[PDB]
Structure formats: structure tokens, C-alpha cells
Amino acid sequence: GSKKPVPIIYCNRRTGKCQRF
């Protein structure tokens, strides 16, 4: 509905801009 758990992560192809879910 609003929030959802994600096993994967995020990676912004930039100057070291990565995320972790």
C-alpha cells in the first residue's frame, strides 16, 4: 500500500551514490 520490503538495493551511477534496502 505504501511501504514494502525490498531485498535488492539501489545504485546511482554517479560519484559513489549507492543505496541499500
Side-chain angles (χ1 to χ4, degrees):
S2 304
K3 292 239 273 150
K4 64 110 91 125
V6 192
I8 89 215
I9 62 71
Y10 208 88
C11 244
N12 222 65
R13 295 145 104 187
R14 304 297 273 172
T15 172
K17 267 210 160 121
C18 215
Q19 331 294 317
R20 274 174 281 163
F21 311 154

